[PDB]
Structures are given as C-alpha cells and as structure tokens.
Paper text:
To investigate the modifications responsible for this difference in structure selectivity, the crystal structure of a 67RuvC D8N mutant was determined at 1.8 Å resolution. This nuclease deficient mutant corresponds to an EcRuvC D7N mutant, which lacks one of four essential catalytic carboxylates, and was chosen to facilitate co-crystallization efforts in the presence of branched and unbranched DNA substrates. Purified 67RuvC D8N was screened for crystallization and well-diffracting crystals obtained in a P-orthorhombic space group subsequently confirmed as P212121. Following unsuccessful efforts to determine the structure of 67RuvC by molecular replacement utilizing models derived from EcRuvC, the structure was solved using phases determined from a selenomethionine-incorporated form of the protein with data collected in a multiwavelength anomalous dispersion (MAD) experiment at three wavelengths. The structural model was refined against a 1.7 Å data set collected at the high energy remote wavelength. The structures presented here, where D8 has been mutated to an asparagine, confirm that these residues are indeed clustered together in a pocket recessed slightly from the surface of the protein, which is partially obscured by a loop formed by residues 12–16. Overall there is no major difference between the structures with and without Mg2+. Residues that come close to the DNA in the junction include R77 and R79, which protrude into the junction centre. The electron density for the side-chains of these residues is weak in the free enzyme structure but it is quite possible that these residues would become ordered when the protein is in complex with the DNA substrate.
Numbering used by the authors:
A (entry chain B): 2 to 160
B (entry chain A): 1 to 160
The structure:
C-alpha cells in the first residue's frame, strides 16, 4: 500500500525519462527524471536515474515502500528491448533493499483498469488525460512518463 | 594485476547449473558456482539468492573494489525467456554495483575467441572445461561449465 510506482525508461530518445509517483502523508508526489544524452550509454543514463531516485527516497525519507515497476517487454526493436530489460533490472537491483521488494506491473493490466486502449502512442495521450484531471501537473503537461507512473500507482492502490 | 570478479551469470533454471565466479586474491585464483536450482522459485527469486551468495563471497574474501566482469546478455529464440534472462542479469549487476568498482560487459564471442574456443554451445562448454581442468582447480571429471566460463572470462579480462 506504501508504493513507489516507476515507469522506467533509459531516455534513448529526446524528452523521455523515468517517471515516479508515490503518496506520503496522503499527498501524491509525481515527477520524471529526464536523462537523454547520446554521449552516455543506456547503462550510464540508468546509473544517473538510480541516483536521482535514491535522492528522492532520502528527501522524502521513504521507509518500507514497495516498488511497483512496469514489466519489461519485447518490442519491435530487439536490441533496444534487451538493453531496456537489462537496464530495468539494474534499476531494480540498485534500489531493492531501499525499497521492500518489488512487483512487476504489466502495461496491459494497469492500462485495462484505467480503460487506456489503442496503440502505444495513443495510450500515452490517454494516460496523460488522467494525470491532467488531478491537477498535480499543469494543463500544458505532455509528460507521459509522469502520467504512466501515476496510473500505475492508482492501479496498485486499488489491487 | 587488475582486481576482477568474473561472473558467468545464470538463474540456475536447469538442475546442476548455477552462477560461476572466479577472482584472484594474493596471486591465487578462487573459483566456484552458486547452485541455486529451485523450480519452486521464479527466476528473479533465484537471482536474489545468487546476489546474496555473491555478497557473502565479497564479504568473506574482502573483495570490495574489485571490478565486475560479466557476460553480455544476448538476443535469443524465445522473446520472453531472453527478456527475463536480460532483466535478471541486470538485477544482479545493480544489486552489487557499489560493492564492486563498476562493471564491464564481456561478450561470449570475445572471451571464446581469445581462448581459441569455437563450435556450438555444448562443444564450447567442453573446450572451456578443458582449460579449467588444466589448472588443477577442479578434478579431471568436472562438468561444471559455469565455473569454467567464469575462469576463462577472468583470464581473458586479465590480459586486457
């Protein structure tokens, strides 16, 4: 029930990032770690993303939170998919112990509970629509990493 | 001699298989395998057990600051199996990075090529074990190819 929700990406494309969401003293906090940098490898960007999340964990002194992280999946691009799966694992291994374990949340599953339907690109705008309603972000927000992490948290808080 | 902890990572999905490790300390090579076979556990749960076993080795033998050399995960025939394997390999590395001074991926092809090992998987296991057996660290009857691959990664990395 004390859940740190993560939508993990290594930010291999511009503007991407790892989204996070959690609730502390009833207040929801959300954000993204924007790590795009072609001078760094996926694993180096991952290291930076780990250290950003560790800094939030210490700032908000999250003790006993459980990681809910979106399951890595094989996509069309095989090498991207294996790199992402490996970096997703690095991220989980680096923070497990700061969190009390973790659970894989299947994209299809949180999406179905929130009625997000259609392809990938369209899921992104549906997820953002839900984030926008809560007014934790402004009406201009185009951060689907943030929106996904939020929707994963709400999925988990129900399940 | 650069201080390297060589790992041949496996989730021990098959009985008798496990994660191989090799390191040199005070000139002596130490090798072994973590035999984590347990079909009652998921691959991630066996990986957690292997992480704890390597942390205990790093503690007992005072290896903080050794550099981790680990095989690169590869693309395979079955999507879900290869994604799970790649994720567990990642988990292992992220759990111990910090105890070790960083890590480097070692491609299977590169260490094999250095050691003049060719052929399909089972032949490569045989040739890798021949190199390990020659050191006397295991007996002439050893079939523990996870130990052999860890050893042969260590010696490949020691030449670089």
């Amino acid at each position: 029930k004390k859940i740190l929700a993560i939508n993990f990406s290594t930010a291999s494309k511009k503007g991407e990032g790892t989204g996070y969401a959690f609730r502390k003293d009833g207040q929801v906090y959300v954000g993204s770690i924007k790590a795009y940098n072609p001078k760094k490898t996926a694993w180096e960007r991952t290291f930076d993303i780990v250290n950003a999340i560790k800094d939030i964990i210490d700032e908000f002194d999250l003790k006993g939170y459980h990681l809910a992280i979106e399951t890595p999946i094989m996509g069309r691009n095989r090498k991207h998919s294996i790199t992402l799966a490996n970096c997703n694992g690095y991220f989980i291994g680096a923070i497990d112990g700061l969190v009390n374990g973790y659970t894989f949340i299947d994209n299809s599953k949180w999406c179905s509970y929130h009625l997000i339907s259609g392809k990938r690109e369209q899921r992104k705008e549906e997820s953002l629509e839900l984030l926008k309603a809560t007014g934790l972000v402004d009406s201009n927000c185009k951060d689907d990493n943030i929106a996904d992490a939020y929707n994963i948290l709400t999925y988990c808080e129900h399940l």
